[PDB]
Design a protein around this ligand. Structure first.
Ligand SMILES: COc1cc(Nc2c(C#N)cnc3cc(OCCCN4CCN(C)CC4)c(OC)cc23)c(Cl)cc1Cl
Ligand SMILES: COc1cc(Nc2c(C#N)cnc3cc(OCCCN4CCN(C)CC4)c(OC)cc23)c(Cl)cc1Cl
Length: 261
């Protein structure tokens, strides 16, 4: 068995806020899923997610504190993030100034380098999956490892993974992909922070699909005005051909990011 060790206090969205019986200052968010709701596939994917999360600890990744179950449900017991999600942070400001976006991208890059060096791909990077430690001067943390996979540079995958407005175009267009899809998604996040919406925002799904399958190079809006190094990074992340896209190593070393310094 049963959900043990926690006092539930509030519905957050099903997700509950709770505190540990042994340390009442330790606050957690508990995601509750009905076993009825899950495929054979989905049971198998949930097990790979838990195995991925149990082995990692990083200041920019939401920590799995515990995993439990009873007769009817599974419970993912996560580090509580009091600042909400990056989606809301952006939308309530409309757009972020370049200087703010830069600090944010450097934090996200630290987490992506940690995962890449362990041959882990997240595969669903987006602002709704990035949580904030507080409302002002936040620390950003990666959430929702539900699509994450073990992937070294050798591995080629086929099953679609991620979210329509964030997915690298080779997933739809070529029906095969590799770890470099996550650099596309990082490009989308940065574009959304600076301009207010993903580059393929559309009135219908059919309109979005046309944009995904187009060969037209992405045109960065000319307002707001951004630094040359910002534009250079953006343009190289948002390359449609993964073989032409900026490398992981080159992304981590880019002067606008500069993860070593
Ligand atoms: C995306 O994926 C996942 C998301 C979650 N969900 C959360 C995790 C995690 N992880 C951590 N901390 C959370 C904190 C939350 O709210 C904080 C308070 C925000 N304010 C409330 C007051 N009003 C006025 C302004 C906004 C929260 O709220 C919905 C959900 C949280 C989980 Cl448990 C699992 C997965 Cl897979
Ligand atoms: C697998 O991956 C992805 C697939 C999609 N694609 C679509 C999603 C989704 N998702 C949802 N709904 C869609 C609806 C569509 O057509 C509706 C209009 C039908 N016709 C109108 C004209 N009359 C004569 C014939 C019928 C559609 O058409 C091409 C594509 C859709 C996207 Cl957008 C992204 C990702 Cl990642």
């Amino acid at each position: 068995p049963r959900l043990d060790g926690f006092i539930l206090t509030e519905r957050l969205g099903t997700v509950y806020k709770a505190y540990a019986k042994k340390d009442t200052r330790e606050v957690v968010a508990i995601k509750c899923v009905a076993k009825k709701s899950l495929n054979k596939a989905s049971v198998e994917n949930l097990l790979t997610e838990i195995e991925i999360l149990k082995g990692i600890r990083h200041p920019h990744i939401v920590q799995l504190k515990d995993f439990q179950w009873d007769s009817d449900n599974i419970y993912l017991i996560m580090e509580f993030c009091a600042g909400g999600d990056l989606s809301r942070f952006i939308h309530t400001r409309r757009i972020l100034p370049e200087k703010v976006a830069r600090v944010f991208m450097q934090q996200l890059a630290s987490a992506l380098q940690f995962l890449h060096e362990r041959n882990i791909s997240h595969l669903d990077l987006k602002p709704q999956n990035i949580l904030l430690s507080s409302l002002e001067k936040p620390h950003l943390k990666l959430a929702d490892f539900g699509f994450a996979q073990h992937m070294s540079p050798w591995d080629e995958k086929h099953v679609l993974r991620g979210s329509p407005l964030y997915m690298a175009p080779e997933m739809v267009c070529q029906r095969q992909y590799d770890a470099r899809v996550d650099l596309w998604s990082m490009g989308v996040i940065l574009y959304e922070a600076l301009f207010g919406q993903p580059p393929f925002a559309s009135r219908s799904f059919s309109e979005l699909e046309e944009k995904i399958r187009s060969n037209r190079v992405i045109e960065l809006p000319l307002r707001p005005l951004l630094s040359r190094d910002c534009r250079d990074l953006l343009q190289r992340l948002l390359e449609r051909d993964p073989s032409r896209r900026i490398s992981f190593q080159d992304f981590f070393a880019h002067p606008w990011v500069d993860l070593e310094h």
